[PDB]
Write a protein that binds this ligand. Sequence first.
Ligand code: HEC
Ligand code: HEM
Ligand code: HEM
Ligand SMILES: COc1c(O)c(C)c(C/C=C(\C)CC/C=C(\C)CC/C=C(\C)CC/C=C(\C)CC/C=C(\C)CCC=C(C)C)c(O)c1OC
Ligand SMILES: CCCCCCCCCCCCCCC(=O)O[C@H](COC(=O)CCCCCCCCCCCC)COP(=O)(O)O
Lengths: 383, 92, 53, 42, 74, 245
Amino acid sequence: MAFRKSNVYLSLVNSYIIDSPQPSSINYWWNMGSLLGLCLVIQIVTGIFMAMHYSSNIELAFSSVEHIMRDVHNGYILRYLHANGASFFFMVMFMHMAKGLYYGSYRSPRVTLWNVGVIIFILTIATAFLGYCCVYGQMSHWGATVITNLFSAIPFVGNDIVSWLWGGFSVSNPTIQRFFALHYLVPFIIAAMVIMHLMALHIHGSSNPLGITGNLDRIPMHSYFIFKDLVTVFLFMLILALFVFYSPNTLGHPDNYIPGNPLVTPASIVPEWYLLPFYAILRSIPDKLLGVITMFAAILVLLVLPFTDRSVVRGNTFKVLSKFFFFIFVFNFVLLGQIGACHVEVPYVLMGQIATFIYFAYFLIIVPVISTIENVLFYIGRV
Amino acid sequence: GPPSGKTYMGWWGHMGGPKQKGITSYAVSPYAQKPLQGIFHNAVFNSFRRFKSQFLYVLIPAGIYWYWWKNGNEYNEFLYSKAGREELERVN
Amino acid sequence: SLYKTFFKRNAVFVGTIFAGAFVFQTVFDTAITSWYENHNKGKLWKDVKARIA
Amino acid sequence: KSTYRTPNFDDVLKENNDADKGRSYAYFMVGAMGLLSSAGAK
Amino acid sequence: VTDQLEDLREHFKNTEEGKALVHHYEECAERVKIQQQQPGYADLEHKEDCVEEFFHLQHYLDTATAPRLFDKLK
Amino acid sequence: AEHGLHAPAYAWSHNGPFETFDHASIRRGYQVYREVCAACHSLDRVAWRTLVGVSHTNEEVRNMAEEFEYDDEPDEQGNPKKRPGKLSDYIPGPYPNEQAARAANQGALPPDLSLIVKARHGGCDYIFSLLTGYPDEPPAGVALPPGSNYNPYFPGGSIAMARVLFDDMVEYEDGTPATTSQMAKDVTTFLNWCAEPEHDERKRLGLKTVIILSSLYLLSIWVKKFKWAGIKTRKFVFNPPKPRK
Ligand code: HEC
Ligand code: HEM
Ligand code: HEM
Ligand SMILES: COc1c(O)c(C)c(C/C=C(\C)CC/C=C(\C)CC/C=C(\C)CC/C=C(\C)CC/C=C(\C)CCC=C(C)C)c(O)c1OC
Ligand SMILES: CCCCCCCCCCCCCCC(=O)O[C@H](COC(=O)CCCCCCCCCCCC)COP(=O)(O)O
């Protein structure tokens, strides 16, 4: 046989990126996965070369990022390509997490591939949150205090965990110096979970937008989806180049350029645009303990979704009402992140309760009942 | 090697679909045909077709949450306006 | 033919890829640099320092 | 219809199929992508 | 040579749209002037201002005098 | 009233994808920093060497950094001694410790402006409209606390920074009129340079990257279609096999 199939090391490359049989009719929404692999390499490579110039002490943490931007040869390219690639990483990931929910990718036999994705989803939120406090900006100090003081709601144990996590009584030198060493570790755990993520993708393969069997028409991965992935790679690196060279500070917040101060709070403590919606779910509940349970459930509610969907068809393509309420839920999340940008004032609190209720009810009431009539409209409409 | 489980895909030769017979395929080498052959009449007529089909699935779902946010924004503007503090104190 | 000289051997096909990419590095760099300075004439440092005369 | 009869591909096909002209145009486009790519990688 | 924005600010102050907004500022300012002279005003814990009216006038002149300013300035 | 008045968009000369800084305005803005806002504000993140070849000539910058003094390594018996500054040193602020800043300015802490442009929402428009946005009297209805001045653009209204910009308080080296609007346009230009000294090179490396990538992106579509041409026009036919077997 051929050497690419006979060698021990080249046979793994052969069966994953060269001879892998792909469905012949997957559209551009299936290119999102390779873009996350491209962005994972960008964060790591631009991070190792930028970790050669960063000090994790509370004294030198902020000052060293300026030295990177002013003294390192092409040091501003390093930090804008790493700060904007973090924001571009989440936009592709939401379009990967939304394409899965539309075409019913979570349904069996791909539930493990769905659960490994949620684990990957959490570790990336922590990785981005941990790397955010590394800059030790004014927004990162108080984003660290609020998020870490959230576990003080677990009864009888919270006060010790918070003191154990801070390494002391507040956010000080022991906190930042251990946040950076963790931030260098977790990407190597995500890279290991992606390997386990592609291992569960290889047993059954990708899905197709029609939601039917794809074993009838397959084409090889090389020269078809290697060159089609090259189309989106150049478009992703072009929009990223516009945000890095022409408007670097559009997505971020200007208050992060102030050194962190423990005495004076900012005018408005707001998270980044990708954690903004869950901030509204936390703040909708008028209690402290109940907020944490409600906030974390919104991630965990995705786990029951393979059970609530009672449809015998995968996807929303041939369903009028199941495709109809999807975009409200899409928009409700788009609306959910809008209140979190506005202060806690009349009548944004009332909007904050109804909107987060319809968010949770989609999984637990609408998807199961509309999916039920849809089975009946399908039945008597043909009979 | 050790035995493995049962999956819903095979490989080149035993992919695992149903047996097929009576279906024929024709193709032509791309060195012999002109790409970009119909990019016009596809950027105009084909795109308009697809848009007219899937555009009430996105507009009305976006037409509800735009009027809902606006009547709250222009209501929050009156509640914190000089003419709407008396309604503010009854909702505060 | 033009094919027989350039595209037949993959040894010389990639050679003229590297040879053409060698020239493009310096020609494109100077072409972009000159227009950029020309579009911003009267603002750059060499124009202010030249004004001191 | 007989299998031997083949479907109409006329609107896709080029009028004059000359291998030296045809492979030269394709190679120049691939060559251009490689030439700019080598510059970007450097 | 006086400043190039104060005099340009005066040109739009006495325009038809500007005169209706500066006057709307004066009608609030005059009633606050007679509201600030009444007895018991110091401990009424609800004082009416004209910031809404002042912000309306000051926002109008900026939108009118934004693009015309920098050409005067070297 | 408490968000602060929104400031409009002005006609800055460096906005747009191809504009560089007006390096004559960086040279003039540095002059009105040294004599107006040098007393109460700091610039701790600017070395002396970055000014060579951007605003001043090398002999000009080697003399500006020599008017100040820096602490030198101890002498033969450990006693401390001072040295004149060189091109590798930074710009010294006006106050030694954070306590001495709050004493001179009524308790208010004046910030370091080496990053002010990217640290106050309102970008270049907020610094310019700050120093020229002071009314002669506060609006009717408001009585300011003692020692504080009114400025509508400031979020919350009341501010502790006074008026420092008048007419003809500075004389330029190229005869430009010294109006309140003229200088406020210049410092924001000089301060934007301090926050982004990579401004011009970033925008010209971007033009090179966009043109290269935009034609790579187009060339890839032709190559994608050339290689996908055999599957796009592939035609299937179906003839039902006989049920004899
Ligand atoms: C008279 C002393 C003085 C001078 C001169 C001075 N400032 Fe200030 N500035 C202050 C003080 C005091 C504060 C703090 C006020 C506070 O935040 O309320 C301040 C605050 C600021 C702020 C922070 C505003 C914000 O929204 O937090 C900026 C920006 C600023 N000054 C810019 C400048 C610029 C630009 C100049 C001249 C180019 C200048 N200052 C000259 C005293 C001065
Ligand atoms: C998926 C992987 C990663 C993500 C999502 C990520 C994300 C981030 C983010 C959002 C920041 C703050 C950016 C800013 O606002 O300035 C940051 C900072 C940083 N990251 Fe990462 N990072 C990743 C991997 C790495 C790795 C592997 C390293 C080092 C080996 C690294 C080193 C750093 C350093 C040193 C900083 C501080 C420097 C600076 O931003 O100024 N990162 N990271
Ligand atoms: C760095 C992070 C990730 C990478 C590199 C990655 C990569 C991939 C790749 C290459 C595929 C196959 C190609 C495709 O379907 O488009 C895939 C499929 C999938 N991924 Fe991910 N993924 C990541 C994160 C996630 C996350 C966070 C989730 C869910 C929250 C997730 C859920 C899925 C699902 C459901 C599929 C199957 C899609 C289908 O077959 O139709 N992945 N992933
Ligand atoms: C199902 O269909 C598929 C599919 O199966 C696959 C595999 C892919 C391809 C995707 C991937 C395989 C993504 C994989 C991503 C990773 C595993 C991340 C890679 C992480 C690393 C490389 C680890 C970090 C290590 C380094 C890069 C070290 C680098 C060294 C440095 C910087 C040292 C330099 C110093 C000196 C001294 C020079 C697809 O795109 C795809 O759909 C098209
Ligand atoms: C994980 C990060 C990337 C995700 C995967 C996306 C796939 C893109 C990889 C690019 C390889 C494409 C060339 C294949 C090849 O060798 O074809 C070779 C030769 O083809 C060529 O002429 C090469 C063209 C040069 C373009 C390469 C630019 C790389 C851009 C950077 C992408 C990654 C950062 C085989 O050609 P064949 O079709 O005859 O078999």
